[PDB]
Symmetry: C4
Subunit: 177 residues, 4 copies
Amino acid sequence: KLENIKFVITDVDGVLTDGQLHYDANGEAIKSFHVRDGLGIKMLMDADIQVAVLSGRDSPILRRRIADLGIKLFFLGKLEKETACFDLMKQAGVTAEQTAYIGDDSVDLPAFAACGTSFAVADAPIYVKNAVDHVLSTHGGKGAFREMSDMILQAQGKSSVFDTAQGFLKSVKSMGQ
Amino acid sequence: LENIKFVITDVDGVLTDGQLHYDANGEAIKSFHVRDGLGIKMLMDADIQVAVLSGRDSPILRRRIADLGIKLFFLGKLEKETACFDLMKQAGVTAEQTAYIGDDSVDLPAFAACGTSFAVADAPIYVKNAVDHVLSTHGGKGAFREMSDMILQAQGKSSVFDTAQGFLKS
Amino acid sequence: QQKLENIKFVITDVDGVLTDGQLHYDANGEAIKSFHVRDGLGIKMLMDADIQVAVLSGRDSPILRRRIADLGIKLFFLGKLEKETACFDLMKQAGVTAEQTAYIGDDSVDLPAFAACGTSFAVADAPIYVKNAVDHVLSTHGGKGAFREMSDMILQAQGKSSVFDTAQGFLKSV
Amino acid sequence: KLENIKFVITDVDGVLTDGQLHYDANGEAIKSFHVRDGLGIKMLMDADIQVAVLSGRDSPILRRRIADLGIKLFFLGKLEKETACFDLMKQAGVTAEQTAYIGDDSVDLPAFAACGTSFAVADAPIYVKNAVDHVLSTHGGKGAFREMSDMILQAQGKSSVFDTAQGFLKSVKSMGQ
Ligand SMILES: [Co+2]
Ligand SMILES: [Co+2]
Ligand SMILES: [Co+2]
Ligand SMILES: [Co+2]
Ligand SMILES: [Hg+2]
Ligand SMILES: [Hg+2]
Ligand SMILES: [Hg+2]
Ligand SMILES: [Hg+2]
């Protein structure tokens, strides 16, 4: 099934971050994203795999990161993830069987069921790890998304875009974040 | 645990990893954990009241409390045992119905004041020896959540976090 | 151990000891410094046990000064890279001998401070050549309560562990 | 080989940092470096080994760090690192055989190839680790640069600047960051 993925939907907190919410007096003040995940996001888009974001918490900081990544499909501040999954797939033009999801907590359980393939980050709780198809070995916010994107691209015969200097230079124009 | 109706949590080293992020004006950022926030909401949904106890008051901590809908708290005081009793009275519960989670010496009187106590995984030996249950998770990395899952499970409500259908109700 | 019981002054490095060594920059320099709450309590415990505490940092910033004010630290030498003389100047301000002073560090800059002090501690993530030069290597990483591990050790050595290890023991100094 | 190093080029994110990009609503807001790396950088320069920074991103935060460190050689904003390497070498007046590089991701693969010696931080992926000469034991942003500088200096018989009080003091006038 990894070979047929055309869409990846990722949760944000605890997946693209280590779960920390850095607050100031006004709310989230800083969100910390991982550079290697950003590169994995860019590699998937470059392999014509779309990437969408689902997050129960909306912030202009998350929105900036999304814009920096060139992500156009996403639902922020929405608690019902199963429905958003189906709405995003329709917007992406793909089926659930062509989509993979990566999450870290209970809110993601319906998202795992709606998607054809699911991943849990390494520090997700056991009831989330037990629900997915693959448990990653990397903690959320430490490159788990990248671990998954490398996995998918490898399954699609595209490991050369990240595992040799040459494949890399041939996509570099689209690798920015 | 089945009879816990109120949970009081220290903030620094429990809801955070103990780091105090300063600028020239004092704390500038406080880092919480997303999975603990969900655990807090699960408890409240399960009619278990939640309070925060902290000897550091800051508008940052108050913004986090507001975002989580936490209704009870005592910010600014170093004498936690008294704060425990005053909070129990506000909550309408007895000590045997209240659990506390802490990480340091200042929490010792609070564990003793409460019926049940939890220590985070990186609490010092003397704090760990004083509690009923030592958590396996480090402060600021989901130790409150580890605690709340255990209380809800004990009360027969693990379905609110352990299955998709289970979760889909609330 | 013998020395620990006679400590009356503790001098601490800041980066890599009271912090995990990260320098959080914005375009103007350090923008945030991250300390540990359990260290703050170990510091107050030492002061309450009549053990003076000073900071010795080769970097000076309004952020670090704010942290020192909150902690109630009165003695500090900030902005001097050569720590050997600053250790001595600090002991003079404190009114203590090198033999009555302990230092906690993490890096080569601290080597002269360990030699100047009577007792020395290294954080768990200090490099081998720093761990090999101190009297006691801590098991806690810097920025994660390494100062507290040391203060609990000093207070324990002086028969004052009660101020941190029991509820009753504690309530007296709050 | 370590004995002949005269120039060290270092990637930034994931090497001098732990890889996190700390965002606010306007992009990166904080960059987090490590104090012992900064001392390693000064030790190198003091021991006649120049240091250069290479990053696919440019920011006034990174420039401030570079300025504080006394680093004069850098190439920022360039995503194609192999030619950046030769350009920095030419600025340094040193050859590739006398240059060492430290990186953490796919983008650095061409950089390892262009330098004479290469190092990967401990949390780099397998494909980056397999490509370098030496895999360090320290994670990026936690002193991996310092692990490398210490190794190079020790190889050159200059370990006394970091392993002795007397050696350090002889060079202190140059150890500020
Ligand atoms: Co999440
Ligand atoms: Co605490
Ligand atoms: Co230091
Ligand atoms: Co990098
Ligand atoms: Hg989905
Ligand atoms: Hg209590
Ligand atoms: Hg000293
Ligand atoms: Hg190079």
